[PDB]
Short mmCIF file of C-alpha atoms and ligand atoms in Angstrom, two decimals:
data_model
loop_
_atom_site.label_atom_id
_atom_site.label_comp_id
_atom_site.label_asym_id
_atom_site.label_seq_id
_atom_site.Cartn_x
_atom_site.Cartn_y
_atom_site.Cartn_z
CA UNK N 368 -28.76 -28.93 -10.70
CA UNK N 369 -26.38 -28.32 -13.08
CA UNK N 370 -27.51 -25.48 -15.36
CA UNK N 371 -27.12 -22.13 -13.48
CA UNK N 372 -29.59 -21.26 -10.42
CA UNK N 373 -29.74 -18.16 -8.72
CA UNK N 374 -31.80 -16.76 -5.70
CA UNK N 375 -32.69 -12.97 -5.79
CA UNK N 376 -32.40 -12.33 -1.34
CA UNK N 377 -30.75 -10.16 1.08
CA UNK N 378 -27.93 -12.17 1.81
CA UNK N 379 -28.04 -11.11 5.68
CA UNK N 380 -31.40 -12.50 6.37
CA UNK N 381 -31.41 -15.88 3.69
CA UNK N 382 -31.16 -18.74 6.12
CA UNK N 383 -28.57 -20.40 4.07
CA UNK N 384 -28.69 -23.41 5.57
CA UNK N 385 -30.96 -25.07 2.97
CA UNK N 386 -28.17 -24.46 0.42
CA UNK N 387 -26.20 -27.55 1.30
CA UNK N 388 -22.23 -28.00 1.01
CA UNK N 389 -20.13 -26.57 -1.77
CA UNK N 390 -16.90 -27.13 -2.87
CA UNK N 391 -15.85 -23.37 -3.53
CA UNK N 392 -17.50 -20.49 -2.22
CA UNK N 393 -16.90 -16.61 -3.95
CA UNK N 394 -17.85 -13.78 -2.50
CA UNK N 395 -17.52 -9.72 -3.81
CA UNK N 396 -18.96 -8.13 -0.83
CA UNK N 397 -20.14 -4.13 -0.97
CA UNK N 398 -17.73 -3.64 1.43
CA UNK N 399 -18.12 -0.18 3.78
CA UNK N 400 -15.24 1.44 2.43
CA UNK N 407 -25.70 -0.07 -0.68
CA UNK N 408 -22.88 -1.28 1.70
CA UNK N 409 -22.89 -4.06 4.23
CA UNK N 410 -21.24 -2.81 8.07
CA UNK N 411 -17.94 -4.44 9.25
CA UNK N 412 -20.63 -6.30 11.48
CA UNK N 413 -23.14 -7.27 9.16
CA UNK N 414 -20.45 -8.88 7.07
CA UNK N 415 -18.44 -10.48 10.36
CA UNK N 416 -21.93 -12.19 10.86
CA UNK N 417 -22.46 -12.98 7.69
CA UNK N 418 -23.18 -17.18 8.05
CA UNK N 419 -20.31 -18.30 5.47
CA UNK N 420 -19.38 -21.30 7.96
CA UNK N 421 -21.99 -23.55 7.77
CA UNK N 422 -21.83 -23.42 3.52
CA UNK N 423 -18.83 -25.67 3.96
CA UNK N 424 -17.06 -28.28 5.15
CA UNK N 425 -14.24 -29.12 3.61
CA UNK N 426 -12.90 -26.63 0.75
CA UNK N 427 -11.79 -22.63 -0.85
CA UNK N 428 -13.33 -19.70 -0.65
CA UNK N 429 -12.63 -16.32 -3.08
CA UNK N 430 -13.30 -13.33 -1.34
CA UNK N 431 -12.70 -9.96 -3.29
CA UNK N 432 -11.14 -7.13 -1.48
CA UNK N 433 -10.10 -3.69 -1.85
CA UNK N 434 -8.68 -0.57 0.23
CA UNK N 435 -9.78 -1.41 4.17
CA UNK N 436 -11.17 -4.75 3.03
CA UNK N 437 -7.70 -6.10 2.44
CA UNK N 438 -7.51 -6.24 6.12
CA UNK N 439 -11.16 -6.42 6.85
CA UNK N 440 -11.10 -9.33 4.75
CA UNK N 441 -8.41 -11.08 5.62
CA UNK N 442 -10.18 -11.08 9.63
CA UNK N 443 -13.96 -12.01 8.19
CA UNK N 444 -11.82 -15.00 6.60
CA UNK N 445 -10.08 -16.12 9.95
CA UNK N 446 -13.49 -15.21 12.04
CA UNK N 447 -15.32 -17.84 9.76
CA UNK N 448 -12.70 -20.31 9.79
CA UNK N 449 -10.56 -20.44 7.07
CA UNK N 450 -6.84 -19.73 6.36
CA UNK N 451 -5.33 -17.31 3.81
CA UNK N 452 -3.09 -19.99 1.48
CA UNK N 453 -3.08 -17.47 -1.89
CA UNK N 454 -4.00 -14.28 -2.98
CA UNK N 455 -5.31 -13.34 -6.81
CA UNK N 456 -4.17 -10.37 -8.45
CA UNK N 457 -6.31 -9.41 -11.51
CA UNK N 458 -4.52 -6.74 -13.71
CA UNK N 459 -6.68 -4.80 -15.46
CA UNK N 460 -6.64 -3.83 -19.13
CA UNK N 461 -8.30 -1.97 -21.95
CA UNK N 462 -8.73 -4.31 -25.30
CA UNK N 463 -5.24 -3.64 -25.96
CA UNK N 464 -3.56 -4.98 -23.20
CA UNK N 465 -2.61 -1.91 -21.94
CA UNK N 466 -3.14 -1.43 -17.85
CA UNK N 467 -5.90 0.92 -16.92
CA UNK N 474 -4.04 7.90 -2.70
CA UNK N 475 -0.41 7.76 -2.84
CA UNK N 476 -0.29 5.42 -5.79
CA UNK N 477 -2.84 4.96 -9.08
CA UNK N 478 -4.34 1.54 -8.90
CA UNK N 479 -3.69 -1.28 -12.14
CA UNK N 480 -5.05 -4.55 -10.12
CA UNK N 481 -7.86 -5.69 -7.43
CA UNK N 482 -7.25 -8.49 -5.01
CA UNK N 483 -9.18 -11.43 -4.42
CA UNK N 484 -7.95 -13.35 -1.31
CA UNK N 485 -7.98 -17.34 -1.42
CA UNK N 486 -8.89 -19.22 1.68
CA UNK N 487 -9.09 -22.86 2.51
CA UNK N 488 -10.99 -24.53 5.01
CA UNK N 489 -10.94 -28.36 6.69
CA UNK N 490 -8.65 -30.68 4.16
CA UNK N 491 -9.81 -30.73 0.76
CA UNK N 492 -8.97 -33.45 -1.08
CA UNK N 493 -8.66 -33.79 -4.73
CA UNK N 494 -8.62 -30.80 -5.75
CA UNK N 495 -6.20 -29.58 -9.19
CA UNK N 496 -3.66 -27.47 -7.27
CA UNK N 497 -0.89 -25.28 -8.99
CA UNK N 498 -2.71 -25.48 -12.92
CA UNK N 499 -3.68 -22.10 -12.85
CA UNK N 500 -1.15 -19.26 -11.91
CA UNK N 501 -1.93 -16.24 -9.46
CA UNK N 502 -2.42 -13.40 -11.67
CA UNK N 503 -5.38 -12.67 -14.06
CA UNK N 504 -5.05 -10.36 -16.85
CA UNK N 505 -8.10 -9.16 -18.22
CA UNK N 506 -10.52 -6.90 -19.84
CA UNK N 507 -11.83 -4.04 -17.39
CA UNK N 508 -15.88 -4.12 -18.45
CA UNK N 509 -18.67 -2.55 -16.43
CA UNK N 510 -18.23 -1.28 -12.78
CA UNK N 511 -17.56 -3.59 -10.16
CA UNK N 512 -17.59 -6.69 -12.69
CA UNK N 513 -14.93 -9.35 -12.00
CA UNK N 514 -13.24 -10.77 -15.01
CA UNK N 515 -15.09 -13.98 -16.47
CA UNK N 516 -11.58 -15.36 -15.92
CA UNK N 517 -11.73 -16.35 -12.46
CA UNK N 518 -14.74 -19.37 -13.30
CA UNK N 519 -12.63 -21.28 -15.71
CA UNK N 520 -9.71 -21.03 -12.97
CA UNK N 521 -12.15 -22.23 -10.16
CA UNK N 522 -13.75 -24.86 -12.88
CA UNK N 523 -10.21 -26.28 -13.36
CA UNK N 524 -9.55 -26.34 -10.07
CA UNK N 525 -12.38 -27.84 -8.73
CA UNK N 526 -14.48 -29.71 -11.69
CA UNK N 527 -17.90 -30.73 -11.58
CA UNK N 528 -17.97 -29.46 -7.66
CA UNK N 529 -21.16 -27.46 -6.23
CA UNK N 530 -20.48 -23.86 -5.88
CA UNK N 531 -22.36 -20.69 -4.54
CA UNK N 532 -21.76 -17.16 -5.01
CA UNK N 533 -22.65 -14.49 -2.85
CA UNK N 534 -23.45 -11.17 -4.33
CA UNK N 535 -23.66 -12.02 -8.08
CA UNK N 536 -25.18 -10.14 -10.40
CA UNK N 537 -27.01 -11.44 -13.17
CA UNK N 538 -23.91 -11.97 -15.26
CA UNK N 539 -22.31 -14.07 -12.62
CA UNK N 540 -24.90 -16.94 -12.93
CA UNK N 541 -23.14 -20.38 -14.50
CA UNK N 542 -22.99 -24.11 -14.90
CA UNK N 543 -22.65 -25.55 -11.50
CA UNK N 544 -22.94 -22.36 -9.49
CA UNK N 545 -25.68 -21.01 -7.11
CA UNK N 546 -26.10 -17.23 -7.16
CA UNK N 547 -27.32 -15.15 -4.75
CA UNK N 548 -27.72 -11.41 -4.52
CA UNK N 549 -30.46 -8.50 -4.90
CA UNK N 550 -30.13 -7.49 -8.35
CA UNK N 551 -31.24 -11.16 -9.61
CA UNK N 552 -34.45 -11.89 -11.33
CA UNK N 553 -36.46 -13.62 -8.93
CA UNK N 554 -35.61 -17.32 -7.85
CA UNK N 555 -34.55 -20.14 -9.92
CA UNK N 556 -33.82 -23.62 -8.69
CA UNK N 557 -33.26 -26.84 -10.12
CA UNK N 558 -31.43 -28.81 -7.62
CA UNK N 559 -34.28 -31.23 -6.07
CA UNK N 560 -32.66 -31.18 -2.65
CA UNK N 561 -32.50 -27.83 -2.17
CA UNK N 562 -36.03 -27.32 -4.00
CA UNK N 563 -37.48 -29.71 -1.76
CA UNK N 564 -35.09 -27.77 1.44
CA UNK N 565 -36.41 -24.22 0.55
CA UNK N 566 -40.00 -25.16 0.09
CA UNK N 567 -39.61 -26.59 3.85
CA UNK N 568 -38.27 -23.20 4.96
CA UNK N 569 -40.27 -20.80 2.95
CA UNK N 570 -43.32 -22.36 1.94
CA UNK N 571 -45.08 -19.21 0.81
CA UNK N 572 -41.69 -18.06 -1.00
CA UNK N 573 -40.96 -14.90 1.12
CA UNK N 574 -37.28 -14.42 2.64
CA UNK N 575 -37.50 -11.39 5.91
CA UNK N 576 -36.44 -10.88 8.61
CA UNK P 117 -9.08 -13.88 -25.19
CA UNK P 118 -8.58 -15.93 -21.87
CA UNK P 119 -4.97 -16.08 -20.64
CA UNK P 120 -5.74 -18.03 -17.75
CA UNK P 121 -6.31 -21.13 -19.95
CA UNK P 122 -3.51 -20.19 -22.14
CA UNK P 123 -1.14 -20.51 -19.08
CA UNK P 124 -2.06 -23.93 -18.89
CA UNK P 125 -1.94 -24.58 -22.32
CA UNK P 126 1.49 -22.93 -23.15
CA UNK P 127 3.15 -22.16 -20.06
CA UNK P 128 3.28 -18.48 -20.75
CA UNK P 129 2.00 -16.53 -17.57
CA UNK P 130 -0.56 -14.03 -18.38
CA UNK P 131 1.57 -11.41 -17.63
CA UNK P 132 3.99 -11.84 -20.48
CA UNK P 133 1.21 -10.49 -22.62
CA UNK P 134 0.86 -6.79 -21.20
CA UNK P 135 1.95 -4.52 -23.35
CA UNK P 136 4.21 -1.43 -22.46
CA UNK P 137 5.47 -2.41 -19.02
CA UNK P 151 7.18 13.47 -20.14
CA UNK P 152 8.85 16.40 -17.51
CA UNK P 153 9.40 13.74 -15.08
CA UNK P 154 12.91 13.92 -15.86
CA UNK P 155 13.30 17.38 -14.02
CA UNK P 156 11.59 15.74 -11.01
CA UNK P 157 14.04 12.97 -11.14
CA UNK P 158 17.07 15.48 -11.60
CA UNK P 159 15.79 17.40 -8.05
CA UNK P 160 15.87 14.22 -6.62
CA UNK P 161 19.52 13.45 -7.57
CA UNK P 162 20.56 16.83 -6.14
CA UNK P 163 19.02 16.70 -2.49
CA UNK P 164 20.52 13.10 -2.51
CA UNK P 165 22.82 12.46 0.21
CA UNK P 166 26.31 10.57 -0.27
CA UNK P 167 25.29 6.89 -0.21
CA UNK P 168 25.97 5.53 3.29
CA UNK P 169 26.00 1.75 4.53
CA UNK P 170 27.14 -0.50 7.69
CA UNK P 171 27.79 -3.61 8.04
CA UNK P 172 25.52 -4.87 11.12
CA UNK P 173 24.17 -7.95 12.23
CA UNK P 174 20.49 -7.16 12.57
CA UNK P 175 19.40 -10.07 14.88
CA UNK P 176 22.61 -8.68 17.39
CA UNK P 177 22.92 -5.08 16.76
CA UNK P 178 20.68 -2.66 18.73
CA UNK P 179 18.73 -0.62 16.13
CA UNK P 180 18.33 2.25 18.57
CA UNK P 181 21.89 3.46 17.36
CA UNK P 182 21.02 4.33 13.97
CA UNK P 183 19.50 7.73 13.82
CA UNK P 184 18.55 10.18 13.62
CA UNK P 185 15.16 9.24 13.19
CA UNK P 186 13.61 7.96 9.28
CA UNK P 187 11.20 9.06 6.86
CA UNK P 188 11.31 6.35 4.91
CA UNK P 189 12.43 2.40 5.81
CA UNK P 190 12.72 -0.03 2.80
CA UNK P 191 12.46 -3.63 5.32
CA UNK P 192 13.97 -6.55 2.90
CA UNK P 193 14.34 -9.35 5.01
CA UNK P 194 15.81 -12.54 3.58
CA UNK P 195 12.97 -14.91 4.12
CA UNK P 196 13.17 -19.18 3.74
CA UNK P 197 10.88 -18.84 0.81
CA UNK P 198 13.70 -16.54 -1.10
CA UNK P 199 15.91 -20.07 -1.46
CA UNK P 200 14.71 -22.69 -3.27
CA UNK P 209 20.89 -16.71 7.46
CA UNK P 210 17.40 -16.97 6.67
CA UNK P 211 14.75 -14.72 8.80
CA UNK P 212 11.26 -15.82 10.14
CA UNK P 213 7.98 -13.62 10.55
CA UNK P 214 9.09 -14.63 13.90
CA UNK P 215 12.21 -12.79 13.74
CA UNK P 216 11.24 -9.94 11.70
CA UNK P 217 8.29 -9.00 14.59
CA UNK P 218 10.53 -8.27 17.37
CA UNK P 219 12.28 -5.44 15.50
CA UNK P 220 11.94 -2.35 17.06
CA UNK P 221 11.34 -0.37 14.01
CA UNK P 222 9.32 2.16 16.22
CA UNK P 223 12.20 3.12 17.69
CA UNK P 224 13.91 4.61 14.89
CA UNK P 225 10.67 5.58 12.58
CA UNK P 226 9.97 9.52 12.66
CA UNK P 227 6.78 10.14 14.45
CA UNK P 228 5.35 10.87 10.43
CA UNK P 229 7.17 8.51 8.40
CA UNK P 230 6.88 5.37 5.78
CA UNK P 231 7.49 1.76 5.36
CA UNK P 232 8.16 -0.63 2.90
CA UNK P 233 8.02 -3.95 3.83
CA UNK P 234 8.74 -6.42 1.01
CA UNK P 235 6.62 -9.78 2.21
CA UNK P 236 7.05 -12.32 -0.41
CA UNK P 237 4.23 -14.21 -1.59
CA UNK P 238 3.17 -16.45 1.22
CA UNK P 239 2.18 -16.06 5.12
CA UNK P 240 4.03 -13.03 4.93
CA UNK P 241 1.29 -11.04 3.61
CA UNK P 242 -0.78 -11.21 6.36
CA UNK P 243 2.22 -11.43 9.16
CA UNK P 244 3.68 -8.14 7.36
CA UNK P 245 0.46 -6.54 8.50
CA UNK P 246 0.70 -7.62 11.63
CA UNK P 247 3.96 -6.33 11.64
CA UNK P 248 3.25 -3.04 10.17
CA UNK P 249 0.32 -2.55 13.04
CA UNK P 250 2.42 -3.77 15.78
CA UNK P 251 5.11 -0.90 14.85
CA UNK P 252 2.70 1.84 14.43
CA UNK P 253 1.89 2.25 10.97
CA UNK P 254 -1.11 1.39 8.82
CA UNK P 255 -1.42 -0.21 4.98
CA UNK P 256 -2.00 2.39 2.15
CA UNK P 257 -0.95 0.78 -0.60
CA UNK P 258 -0.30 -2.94 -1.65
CA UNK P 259 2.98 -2.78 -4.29
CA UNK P 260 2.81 -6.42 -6.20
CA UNK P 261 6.31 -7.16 -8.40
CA UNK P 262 4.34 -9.24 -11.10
CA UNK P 263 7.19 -11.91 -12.62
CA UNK P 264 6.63 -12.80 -16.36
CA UNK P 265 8.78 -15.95 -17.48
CA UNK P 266 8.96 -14.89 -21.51
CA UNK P 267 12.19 -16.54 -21.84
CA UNK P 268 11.42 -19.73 -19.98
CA UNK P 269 7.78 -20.70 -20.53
CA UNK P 275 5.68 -24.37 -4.73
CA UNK P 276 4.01 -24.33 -0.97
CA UNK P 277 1.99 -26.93 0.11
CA UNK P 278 -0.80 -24.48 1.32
CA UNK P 279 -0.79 -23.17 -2.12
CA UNK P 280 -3.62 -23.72 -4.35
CA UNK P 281 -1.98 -21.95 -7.40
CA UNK P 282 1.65 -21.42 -9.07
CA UNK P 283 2.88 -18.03 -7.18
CA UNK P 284 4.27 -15.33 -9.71
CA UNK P 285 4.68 -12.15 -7.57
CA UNK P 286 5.69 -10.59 -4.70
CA UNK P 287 4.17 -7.80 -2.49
CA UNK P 288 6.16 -4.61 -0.93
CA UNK P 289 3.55 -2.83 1.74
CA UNK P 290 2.98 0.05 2.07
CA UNK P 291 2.57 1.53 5.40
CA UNK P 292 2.54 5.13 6.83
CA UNK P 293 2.37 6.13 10.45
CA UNK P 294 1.18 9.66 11.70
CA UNK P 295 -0.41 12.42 9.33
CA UNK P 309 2.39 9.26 -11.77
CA UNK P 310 3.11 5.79 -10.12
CA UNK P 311 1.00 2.30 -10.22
CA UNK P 312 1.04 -0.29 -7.72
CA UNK P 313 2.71 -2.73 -10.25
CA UNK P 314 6.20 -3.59 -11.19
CA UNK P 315 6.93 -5.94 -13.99
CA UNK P 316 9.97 -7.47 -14.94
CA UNK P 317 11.22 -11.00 -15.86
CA UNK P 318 11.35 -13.34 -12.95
CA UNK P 319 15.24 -13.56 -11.80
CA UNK P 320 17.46 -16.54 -12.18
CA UNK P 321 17.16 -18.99 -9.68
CA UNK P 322 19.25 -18.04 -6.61
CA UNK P 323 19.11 -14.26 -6.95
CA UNK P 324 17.29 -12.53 -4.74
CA UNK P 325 17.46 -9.20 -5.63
CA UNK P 326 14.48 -6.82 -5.85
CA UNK P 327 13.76 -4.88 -8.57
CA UNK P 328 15.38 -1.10 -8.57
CA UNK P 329 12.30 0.21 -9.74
CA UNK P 330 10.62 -0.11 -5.89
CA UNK P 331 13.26 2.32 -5.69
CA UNK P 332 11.67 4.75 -8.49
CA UNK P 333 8.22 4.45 -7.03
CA UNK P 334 9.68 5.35 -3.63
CA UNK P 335 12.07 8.46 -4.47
CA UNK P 336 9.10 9.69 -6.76
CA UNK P 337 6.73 10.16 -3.40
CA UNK P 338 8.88 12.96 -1.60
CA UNK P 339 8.59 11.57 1.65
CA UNK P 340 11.48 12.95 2.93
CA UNK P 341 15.69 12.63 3.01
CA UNK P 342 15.86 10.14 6.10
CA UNK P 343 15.82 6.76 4.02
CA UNK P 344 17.12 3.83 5.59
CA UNK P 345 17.38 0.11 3.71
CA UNK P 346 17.58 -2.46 6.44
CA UNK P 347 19.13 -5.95 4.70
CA UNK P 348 20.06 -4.32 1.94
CA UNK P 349 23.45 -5.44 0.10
CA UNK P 350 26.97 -4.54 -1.38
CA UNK P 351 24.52 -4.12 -4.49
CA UNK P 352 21.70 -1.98 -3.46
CA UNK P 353 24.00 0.96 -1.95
CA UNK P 354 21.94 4.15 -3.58
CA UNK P 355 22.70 8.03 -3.24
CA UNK P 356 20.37 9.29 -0.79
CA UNK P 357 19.81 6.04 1.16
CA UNK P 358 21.96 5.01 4.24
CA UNK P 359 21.91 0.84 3.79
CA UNK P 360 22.51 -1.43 6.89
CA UNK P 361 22.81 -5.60 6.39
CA UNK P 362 24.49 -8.46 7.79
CA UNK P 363 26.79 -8.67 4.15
CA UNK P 364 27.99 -5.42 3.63
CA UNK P 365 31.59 -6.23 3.09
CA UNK P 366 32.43 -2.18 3.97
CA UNK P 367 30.95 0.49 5.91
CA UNK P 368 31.58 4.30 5.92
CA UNK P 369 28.70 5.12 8.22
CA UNK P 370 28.51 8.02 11.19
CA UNK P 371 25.56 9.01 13.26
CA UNK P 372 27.54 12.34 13.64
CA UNK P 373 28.17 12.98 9.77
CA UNK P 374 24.68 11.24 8.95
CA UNK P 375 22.94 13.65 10.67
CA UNK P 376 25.05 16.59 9.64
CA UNK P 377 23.29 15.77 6.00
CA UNK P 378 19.98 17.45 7.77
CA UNK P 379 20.61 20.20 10.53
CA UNK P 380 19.50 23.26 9.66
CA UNK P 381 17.94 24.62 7.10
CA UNK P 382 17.84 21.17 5.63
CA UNK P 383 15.56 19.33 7.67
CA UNK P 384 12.45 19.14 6.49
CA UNK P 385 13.06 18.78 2.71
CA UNK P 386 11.35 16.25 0.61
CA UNK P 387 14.17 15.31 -1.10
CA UNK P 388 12.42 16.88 -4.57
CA UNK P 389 12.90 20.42 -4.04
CA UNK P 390 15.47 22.50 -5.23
CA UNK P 391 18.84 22.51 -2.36
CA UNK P 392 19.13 25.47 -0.02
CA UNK P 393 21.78 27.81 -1.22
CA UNK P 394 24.48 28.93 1.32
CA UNK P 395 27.35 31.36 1.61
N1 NWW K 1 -21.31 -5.93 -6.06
C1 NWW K 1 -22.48 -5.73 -5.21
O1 NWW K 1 -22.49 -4.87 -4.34
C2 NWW K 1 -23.72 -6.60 -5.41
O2 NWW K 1 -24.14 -7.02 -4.25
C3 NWW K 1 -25.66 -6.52 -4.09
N2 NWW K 1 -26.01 -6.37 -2.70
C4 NWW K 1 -25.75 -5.33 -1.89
N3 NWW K 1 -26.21 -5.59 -0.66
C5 NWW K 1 -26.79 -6.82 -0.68
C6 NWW K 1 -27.46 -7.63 0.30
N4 NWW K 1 -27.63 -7.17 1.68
N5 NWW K 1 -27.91 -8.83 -0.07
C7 NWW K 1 -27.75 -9.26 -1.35
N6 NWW K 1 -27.15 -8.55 -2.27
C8 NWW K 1 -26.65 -7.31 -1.97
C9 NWW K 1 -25.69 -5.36 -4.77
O3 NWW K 1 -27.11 -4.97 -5.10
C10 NWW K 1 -24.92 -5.74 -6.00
O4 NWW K 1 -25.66 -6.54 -6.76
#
């Protein structure tokens, strides 16, 4: 409700709809580049998680431009795009070209209102850690930008879970909600706690 | 630890805190020697039928002056209805600088709608060490993207200098490194470039050239025979 809640699912089949609204929405899909097809993830039900607000949506080779369409198919608008440079501790950066940054695309959807916009700059510098992990960065950016908001990410791993976030992915432990609403929303749904088909 | 919130405590982009921004020099001493004689024309882009520069590119550097730039000015309107098909070679590269805004997804509309497809996403990273805004935007925009786009069958993708002054528009040279360094090729056209950017090995064609020394006839006398399918990083053909 507050504290950090995940649910361990396959995101294709979780009838997020019990979730509720959120603020912010940040996704770092296994693009096909375990992968997800360029259908599963166009189907993927992102729109009804909000009404009025940003979604982060990570990206790399063919997803730049995969991406960018699964963001206009569920109805937002590309307004920024992150850059994270990546370092060793020293702040040193790690086909045609070798590769120092990922992207992470920024869309907006409806009018959000009252959001900070412009504290936080467009670049991320930060320590490379394991595979695939994002920088630790990007929550304090979204935090400041949006503070005290609900928010949900999709595809977390356990290190993603924080304050004011809902996690979901495969590689979580299990399911852990505190949120009354949405307790009260997914015993309605799954009363015998199973999530197929 | 976490530049982010420095930025908003100090000012001081994270970027301004990378550090360090061998027989390469050889390589770039081949490249100086298949270089052409710089040429240029002065041509109004918008008015000038592109189908009379030729023969054919490898390379295009695509610089158009967008609004954004200033704070004549080209739209993503104007910049579509090029015909840069016309003049690419059927195998052949792009570099499309976009800016930071709705140009990075109308530049890939672009680059599909002339024939070519993204392989690489070039981002000019600004810092702002010596002197620590869209509506859309939902942060402060500190680079730019060049794309990268190649059509038919050393280096990072980052470029780091001190965001200009105010007013200048200029690119940074080093796009030019990162370009010469690939061998695409001697056929390397800069469309908008300037007085400024006029380069060995690159025939330059803008609306404020102030001269022009260009000929299709000599131009393509540069690569007949048995010059004309060099990369531009070999060793030069010897004759007599
Ligand atoms: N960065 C990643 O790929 C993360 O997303 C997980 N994942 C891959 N497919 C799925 C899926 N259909 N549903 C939920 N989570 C998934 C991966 O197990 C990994 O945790």
């Amino acid at each position: 409700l507050f504290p950090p809640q995940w649910i361990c699912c396959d995101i294709r089949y979780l009838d997020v709809s019990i979730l509720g609204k959120f603020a912010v929405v940040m996704a770092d899909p296994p693009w096909d580049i375990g992968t997800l097809t360029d259908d599963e993830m166009r189907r993927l039900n992102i729109p009804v998680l909000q009404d009025d607000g940003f979604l982060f949506l990570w990206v790399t080779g063919r997803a730049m431009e995969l991406g960018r369409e699964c963001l206009n198919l569920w109805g937002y608008e590309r307004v920024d795009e992150i850059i994270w440079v990546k370092t060793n501790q020293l702040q040193r950066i790690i086909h045609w070209l070798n590769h120092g940054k990922e992207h992470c695309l920024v869309g907006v959807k409806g009018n959000p209102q009252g959001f900070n916009q412009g504290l936080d700059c467009d670049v991320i510098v930060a320590e490379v850690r394991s595979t695939s992990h994002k920088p630790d960065e990007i929550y304090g950016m979204i935090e400041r930008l949006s503070p005290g908001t609900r928010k949900i990410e999709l595809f977390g791993r356990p290190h993603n879970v924080q304050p004011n976030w809902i996690t979901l992915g495969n590689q979580l432990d299990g399911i852990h909600l505190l949120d009354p609403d949405v307790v009260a929303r997914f015993k309605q749904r799954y009363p015998d706690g199973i999530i197929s088909k | 630890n976490d530049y982010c919130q420095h930025f908003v405590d100090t000012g001081h982009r994270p970027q301004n805190f990378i550090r360090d921004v061998e027989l390469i020099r050889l390589k770039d001493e081949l490249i100086a020697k298949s270089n052409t004689p710089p040429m240029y024309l002065q041509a109004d882009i918008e008015a000038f039928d592109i189908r009379e520069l030729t023969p054919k590119f490898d390379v295009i550097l695509l610089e158009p002056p967008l609004e954004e730039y200033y704070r004549k000015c080209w739209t993503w309107d104007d910049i579509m209805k090029l015909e840069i098909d016309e003049i690419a070679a059927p195998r052949s590269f792009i570099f499309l600088w976009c800016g930071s805004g709705e140009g990075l997804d109308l530049g890939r509309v672009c680059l599909r709608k002339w024939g070519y497809r993204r392989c690489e996403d070039i981002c000019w990273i600004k810092t702002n060490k010596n002197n620590p805004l869209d509506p859309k935007a939902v942060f402060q925009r500190t680079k730019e993207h060049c794309l990268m786009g190649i059509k038919g069958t050393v280096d990072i993708d980052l470029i780091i200098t001190e965001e200009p002054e105010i007013g200048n528009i200029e690119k940074p040279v080093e796009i030019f490194h990162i370009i010469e360094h690939f061998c695409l090729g001697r056929r390397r056209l800069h469309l908008f470039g300037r007085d400024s950017t006029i380069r060995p090995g690159w025939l330059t064609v803008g609306p404020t050239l102030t001269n022009s020394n260009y000929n299709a006839e000599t131009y393509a006398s540069y690569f007949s025979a048995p010059n004309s399918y060099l990369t531009g990083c070999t060793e030069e053909i010897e004759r007599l």
